[PDB]
Amino acid sequence: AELHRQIWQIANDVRGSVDGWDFKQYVLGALFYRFISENFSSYIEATDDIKDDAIKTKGYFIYPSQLFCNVAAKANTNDRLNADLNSIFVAIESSAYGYPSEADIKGLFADFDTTSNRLGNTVKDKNARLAAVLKGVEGLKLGIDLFGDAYEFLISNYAAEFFTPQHVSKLIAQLAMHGQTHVNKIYDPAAGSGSLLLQAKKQFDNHIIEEGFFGQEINHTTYNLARMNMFLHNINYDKFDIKLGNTLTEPHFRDEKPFDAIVSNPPYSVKWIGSDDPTLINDERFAPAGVLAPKSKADFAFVLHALNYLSAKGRAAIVCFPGIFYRGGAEQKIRQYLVDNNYVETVISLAPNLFFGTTIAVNILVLSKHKTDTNVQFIDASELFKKETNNNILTDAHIEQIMQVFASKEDVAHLAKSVAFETVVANDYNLSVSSYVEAKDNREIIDIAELNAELKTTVSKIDQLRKDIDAIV
Amino acid sequence: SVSSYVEAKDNREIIDIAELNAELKTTVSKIDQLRKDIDAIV
Amino acid sequence: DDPTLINDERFAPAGVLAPKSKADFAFVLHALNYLSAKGRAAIVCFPGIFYR
Amino acid sequence: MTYNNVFDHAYEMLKENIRYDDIRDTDDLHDAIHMAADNAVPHYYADIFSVMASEGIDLEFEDSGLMPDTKDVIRILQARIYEQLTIDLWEDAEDLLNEYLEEVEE
Amino acid sequence: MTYNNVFDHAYEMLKENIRYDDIRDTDDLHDAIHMAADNAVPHYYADIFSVMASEGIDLEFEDSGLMPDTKDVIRILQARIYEQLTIDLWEDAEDLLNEYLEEVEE
Amino acid sequence: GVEVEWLPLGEITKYEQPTKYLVKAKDYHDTYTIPVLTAGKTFILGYTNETHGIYQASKAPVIIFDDFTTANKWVDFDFKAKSSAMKMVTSCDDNKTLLKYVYYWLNTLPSEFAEGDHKRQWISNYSQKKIPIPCPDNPEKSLAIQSEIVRILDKFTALTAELTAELNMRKKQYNYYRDQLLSFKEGEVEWKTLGEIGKWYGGGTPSKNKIEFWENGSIPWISPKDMGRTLVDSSEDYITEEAVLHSSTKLIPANSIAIVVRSSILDKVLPSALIKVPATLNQDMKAVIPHENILVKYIYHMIGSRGSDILRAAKKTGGSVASIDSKKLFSFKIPVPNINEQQRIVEILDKFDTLTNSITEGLPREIELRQKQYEYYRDLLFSF
């Protein structure tokens, strides 16, 4: 785009030419180091120094330790490292990431900068490689809040295996919002990356600041990129945490809180053996379920985790699988427990694909604790221009169609509508029976196609006649 | 190979023994036209 | 050629060399050097030769 | 991601549908095979092609009625996965009927 | 076995057909692309599915005339490989014409 | 029918899975005998029909295809296969159903059956309900008043079957009848080489990255996905008039013909069509215009009759997905007679295939319109 395209090209130059999972770590370290280089400069110049020195304060060091918590030195940054091009040797960054990550006092979010590993074959191959890589990194066009914006595509460089497409982020943001300007936001089990966590409050920071962003995820490098994701995008410091571990086996905080909004995105085949092998039969959140979740359908364990941590003022916004009729005897009654009260507010389907090789659409379940109580299944399949989302990725106003459907129970022909509570007690509580409104219904007329066919047969008779005449040349 | 490829599974048809067969098909088809046209009115 | 394989003994009367991705017939020009007057070679190839 | 990886998920969902539904019929549990094996197929592109590049499965059908005669190549591959898994779960159901229903007597 | 592995063989056979035939025409060298790119596709099952599981290539055609409307799924995959390689060799031939024919002046 | 009541489907219906199958033999050539009936086009090649645990397909059950579809319906005609996903529908009661009747009624509800989008199994849903039944006239005259209407439906299904049979025999006899006439011509007709009848044009293909060259336009584009027809007047693709700046194409006149040279031949018969608009075609096929000594219909029907030998002439060209060379397609001689033996015999063979060929001036205008109004007569007859 405007500067998406130029920095896009200069950054996609760096991707060559081997498996990018390993040297993407060096790319992350270089861009993270440059963001530190300019963030700490933006603090200390708020016009003195173009370049710095090695000061020995230990008090002026410890003032941003409680305030920004990136305390290495003054002159160990990327604007100051560019004097040392191909600096022998490569792993001085392994020293240059250690003393900023001392971080015992206070409030670390450290034990974190182990991205830049050591491979490599020898030390000089690493030296020439990171010299060329830092040459390409500093060679990026700087310009100033958009500096992590190309880093957006750096989190989606693999997805053109599981992060988010941005229209879904804006959808779940506009479904968790709004009208609940109260403590707090936000909580996230199966956080993945902080992409879907971003555009809710990054657009709506001026709405209200309330509290921190609460994440938890499994994979270690995904844990690292997630905990740098909201770091690089000019978000604050204090309670913006992602913990490590399975959210099912290790949820915390238990006490904090019945929240006001949560977002998530679960992957398929995140299984766990029921029902149960662990002590989650006797937990604090699956006693509402009664029967518990089976192995290969571990998605609804997240939504039974969801009603634990949510207040009746607040609402939910999560996503699920369309691959459902009843999901065994141990989940038909779980869908019965979901529809047993007005737990579910709305459900919204999408259109295939507009993803990265799925190729099917998704379910989107929006929940609260609020009595109306009609299970309004406001699905959509067209449109939903599901070919490409590049129609104004900043402000599409495509959710304005959905928010307009969200306004007051829109009974729109060839679109979903407000369906009753006991319209779905007749079905086996599926999604969607209603509505799927009846396109391409075509029928005919008695006599129009037959006097035509009579004229066609009279053409065929004279065809037979000059067939019989022209048997002799 | 092009050579030799000696002339297996090669087939032709018949000139005019199948035209009076299709003509008998059409003489069935005339009363088929009539059985559609009469039964088109209930 | 970059190497000396133009002037080798198994390529004395034949013709110009075999390129890189179509290196099948280098084995068969290697073949009929290592054969007597009496016996015979039995080699296998891709079908898709028009003239390659 | 081999064929055995998908076969393990289909195996465990078959054990779910036999176990927690407590069905003691061959035909209804083969309808449960129609439930479970269709729900155990992968959905990513590369996760399908990794099973297709693995052993066990071949390219060609036996019933061409599983093929939509169109550009839907991934539907054809998914139907081949479904067919191989339904054959293996014919054998697996004929095992697990007399393996499991003798076990649940208590 | 990525897409780039097959693209390197097609690249080198294109350089052969431009180089050792010494053709200075766009259309005849695109017929040489029709020669070389069709001869650089793999033939093993897993070596095709590894390229299909790799990046670059997608599933869907642009011309459905490359598809034999039948059970020949591997022909469809091979035609998709051929189509992606012919597009990349459109770009590669428009590079290597003015890259190579300026070089051979001696 | 005096009394009409709606009844559930599964009340008078026995549904069953197919029996156990192991029918993966490695060769199932046409020398065998069983009809292997599948979904879509309901015929794959034969197999030996006895002692395989075969269900043997007795006097009138019906089937359903398939998982994800539940819409394809075929009469089990005489005695056929059980082809490994044929889920069987029959009836316990025999004195009411006569389940070719419920075959004739099951295809009357396109409401849910025209929506195949998601991955589900729908067995219980059509297993429930509904059906219109002449109950409570049972068993006195329930099927007796159904006899007239099943006579209507059976004669009309017979109309469709005989039209397909006479179209088959018409195309068979016509394909060989093109070539006692007009062939082996003597004596002696000039064996004029192709390409000496007119400067025919190659083709050309733009790259499809530029949206300005691709999004709009009115010049018709010819690709072999749009081919396989006869007498193409337009196609799916219209290309931009600006895009001929770098299309590498030639604008051909409005009485042209076109011929595929890629991947249609080397397996089956190459198609051809009279292209009537000034259009452009791709790299993968060729445009033929003849020059003034002729009628273009004569060259068209000449190639359309001699296709089975001009595919033989340069058949292999290696084991490629690429195909027949340009030179051996260029170097074939066709008999080109005097002017009196062009227009008369081409009006003969042109009137004959403008009897046959789709669509306008053809038999499908009869056939699909009969199908449409047959379905509408079914829907009009089946109300209360």
Domains of chain D: 2-102 (1.20.120.780)
Q: In terms of C-beta distances under 8 Å and separation of at least 24 residues, what long-range contacts does F23-27 make, across chains too?
A: F23/D62, F23/F47, F23/F52, F23/F83, F23/F84, F24/D62
Kindly state whether residue A470 falls inside one of the protein's structural domains: no
CA dist F304 and F270 (Å) reads 9
| Beta-carbon contacts below 8 Å between A and F | 60
Domain's final residue, options A99, A128, A155: A155
CA dist A426 and A420 (Å) reads 11
Q: Determine contact: D14 vs chain A, CB below 8 A.
A: no
Q: From chain E, pick out residues whose CB is under 8 angstroms from the CB of D63.
A: none
Indicate the resolution in Å: 4.4
Check CB contact under 8 Å for C19 and E40: no
CA dist F102 and F114 (Å) reads 19
CA dist A440 and D29 (Å) reads 37
Q: DSSP label at F225?
A: T
CATH number at residue A388: 3.40.50.150
Residue D25: CB partners within 8 Å, gap ≥ 6? none
Q: Determine contact: E87 vs chain F, CB below 8 A.
A: yes
Query: Which has the closest alpha carbon to A247: A191, A200, A185, A195?
Result: A191
Check CB contact under 8 Å for A454 and B40: no
Backbone angles phi, psi at F183, to 5 degrees: -115, 175
Coil, strand or helix: which one is E84?
A: helix
- Mark whether A348 and A376 lie in a shared domain: yes
CA dist A419 and A438 (Å) reads 16
Query: Which has the closest alpha carbon to A243: A256, A259, A260, A261?
Result: A256
Residue F80: CB partners within 8 Å, gap ≥ 6? F34, F35, F36, F37, F57
**What are the distances in angstroms from CA F62 to CA A165, A371, C15, F104?**
46, 49, 69, 11
Q: How many domains is chain A partitioned into structurally?
A: 2
CA distance D15 to chain E (A): 31
CB F85 within 8 A of CB F21: no
Angle between helices A20-44 and A123-138 (to 10 degrees): 50
Coil, strand or helix: which one is F73?
A: coil
Q: From chain E, pick out residues whose CB is under 8 angstroms from the CB of F248.
A: 26-27
CA dist F303 and F326 (Å) reads 15
C and A adjacent (3 or more CB pairs under 8 angstroms): no
CA dist A445 and F370 (Å) reads 11
Alpha helices in chain B (DSSP H): 19-39
Residue D63: CB partners within 8 Å, gap ≥ 6? D83, F38, F83, F84, F85
- Mark whether A334 and A378 lie in a shared domain: yes
The tally of CA atoms less than 13 A away on the side-chain side of residue F30 is 2
Q: Where in chain F is the domain with CATH 3.90.220.20?
A: 5-155+377-379, 190-364
Q: For residue F359, is the peptide bond before it cis, meaning its omega torsion is within 30 degrees of 0?
A: yes
Query: Which has the closest alpha carbon to A358: E3, D66, D80, D48?
Result: D48
Q: Determine contact: F8 vs chain A, CB below 8 A.
A: no
Dihedral sign of CA atoms F182, F188, F194, F196 in order: negative
Dihedral sign of CA atoms D79, D82, D83, D84 in order: positive
CA distance C52 to chain E (A): 9
Backbone angles phi, psi at A366, to 5 degrees: -120, 120
CB A225 within 8 A of CB A193: yes
Coil, strand or helix: which one is B9?
A: coil
CA dist A242 and A142 (Å) reads 29
Backbone angles phi, psi at F15, to 5 degrees: -100, 145
Cα angle A43, A44, A45; round to 5: 95
Kindly state whether residue A460 falls inside one of the protein's structural domains: no
Check CB contact under 8 Å for F207 and E38: no
Kindly state whether residue A71 falls inside one of the protein's structural domains: yes
Kindly state whether residue A209 falls inside one of the protein's structural domains: yes
CA distance A467 to chain F (A): 7
Bridge pairing between strands F129-133 and F5-8? antiparallel
| Token pair listed for A137 | 């990194």
- Mark whether A257 and A203 lie in a shared domain: yes
CA distance F369 to chain A (A): 5
| Token pair listed for F331 | 């170097």
CA distance A295 to chain D (A): 7
Bridge pairing between strands F219-222 and F280-281? parallel
- Mark whether A151 and A220 lie in a shared domain: no
Check CB contact under 8 Å for D59 and E46: no
Cα angle A53, A56, A59; round to 5: 120
What b-and-e string marks burial along F131-153, b requiring 16 or more CB atoms within 10 Å of the CB? Answer: bebbeebeeeebbeebeebeebb
CATH number at residue A18: 1.20.1260.30
Superfamily of domain F190-364: DNA methylase specificity domains (3.90.220.20)
- The residue of chain F with its CA nearest to that of D70 is F40
CA dist F357 and F55 (Å) reads 40
Check CB contact under 8 Å for F163 and B29: yes
Chain centroid offset of residue F163 CA: 14
A231 is in an annotated binding site: no
CA dist A209 and D12 (Å) reads 46
- Mark whether A145 and A259 lie in a shared domain: no
Q: Determine contact: F68 vs chain A, CB below 8 A.
A: no
Backbone angles phi, psi at F235, to 5 degrees: -135, -170
Backbone angles phi, psi at F133, to 5 degrees: -135, 140
CB D93 within 8 A of CB D26: yes
Angle between helices E3-19 and E45-53 (to 10 degrees): 100
Dihedral sign of CA atoms F212, F216, F220, F226 in order: positive
Angle between helices D45-53 and E45-53 (to 10 degrees): 170
Kindly state whether residue A469 falls inside one of the protein's structural domains: no
Check CB contact under 8 Å for F172 and B13: yes
Bridge pairing between strands F219-222 and F129-133? unpaired
CB A262 within 8 A of CB A310: yes
CB D16 within 8 A of CB D98: no
Query: Residue for token digits 């400069």?
Result: A41
Q: From chain D, pick out residues whose CB is under 8 angstroms from the CB of A330.
A: 16, 20
Coil, strand or helix: which one is D88?
A: helix
For A414, the domain range is: 166-426
- Mark whether A194 and A73 lie in a shared domain: no
Residue E38: CB partners within 8 Å, gap ≥ 6? E82, F320, F321, F322
- Mark whether A187 and A63 lie in a shared domain: no
**CATH number, domain F5-155+377-379:** 3.90.220.20
3-state helix/strand/coil string of chain A: CCCHHHHHHHHHCCCCCCCHHHHHHHHHHHHHHHHHHHHHHHHHCCCCCCCCCCCCCCCCCCCCCCCCCCCCCCCCCHHHHCCCCCCCCCCHHHHHCCCCCCCCCCCCCCCCCCCCCCCCCCHHHHHHHHHHHHHHHHCCCCCCHHHHHHHHHHHCCCCCCCCCCHHHHHHHHHHHCCCCCCCCCCECCCCCCCHHHHHHHCCCCCCCCCCCCEEEECCHHHHHHHHHHHHHCCCCCCCCEEEECCCCCCCCCCCCCCECCECCCCCCCCCCCCCCCCHHHHCCCCCCCCCCCCCCCCHHHHHHHHCCCECCCCECCEEECCCCCCCCHHHHHHHHHHCCCCCEEEEEECCCCCCCCCCCCCEEEEEECCCCCCCECCCCCCCCCCCCCCCCCCCCCCHHHHHHHHHCCCCCCCCCCCCCCCCCCCCCCCCCCCCCCCCCCCCCCCCHHHHHHHHHHHHHHHHHHHHHHCCCC
Residue F152, H or E segment: helix F146-177
Q: DSSP label at F15?
A: E
A217 is in an annotated binding site: yes
CA dist F323 and F185 (Å) reads 30
CB A22 within 8 A of CB A119: yes
Query: Which has the closest alpha carbon to A347: A317, A325, A372, A373?
Result: A317
CA dist F78 and B17 (Å) reads 29
What b-and-e string marks burial along A27-65, b requiring 16 or more CB atoms within 10 Å of the CB? Answer: bbbbbbbbbbbebbbeeeeeeeeeebeeeeeeeeeeeeb
Coil, strand or helix: which one is F75?
A: strand
Coil, strand or helix: which one is F90?
A: strand
- The residue of chain B with its CA nearest to that of F376 is B40
Kindly state whether residue A183 falls inside one of the protein's structural domains: yes
Q: From chain A, pick out residues whose CB is under 8 angstroms from the CB of B19.
A: 467, 471
Backbone angles phi, psi at A466, to 5 degrees: -80, -5
Q: DSSP label at E40?
A: S
- Mark whether A404 and A255 lie in a shared domain: yes
R_g of chain B computed on alpha carbons: 21
Backbone angles phi, psi at F65, to 5 degrees: -115, 135
Q: Determine contact: A454 vs chain F, CB below 8 A.
A: no
Check CB contact under 8 Å for F111 and A438: yes
- The residue of chain F with its CA nearest to that of A453 is F366
- Mark whether A196 and A118 lie in a shared domain: no
CB F130 within 8 A of CB F8: yes
Query: Residue for token digits 């998530």?
Result: A264
Residue F40: CB partners within 8 Å, gap ≥ 6? D64, D65, D67, D68, D69, F72
Partner chains of D (3+ C-beta pairs under 8 Å): A, E, F
- Mark whether A8 and A67 lie in a shared domain: yes
CB F316 within 8 A of CB C48: no
| Token pair listed for E70 | 């039948």
A and B adjacent (3 or more CB pairs under 8 angstroms): yes
Tell me which amino acid residue F117 is: D
CA dist A461 and A130 (Å) reads 84
Query: Which has the closest alpha carbon to A169: A203, A145, A138, A144?
Result: A203
A194 is in an annotated binding site: yes
- Mark whether A204 and A147 lie in a shared domain: no
Dihedral sign of CA atoms F379, F380, F382, F384 in order: positive
Q: From chain D, pick out residues whose CB is under 8 angstroms from the CB of A271.
A: 9
| Token pair listed for F186 | 């003597």
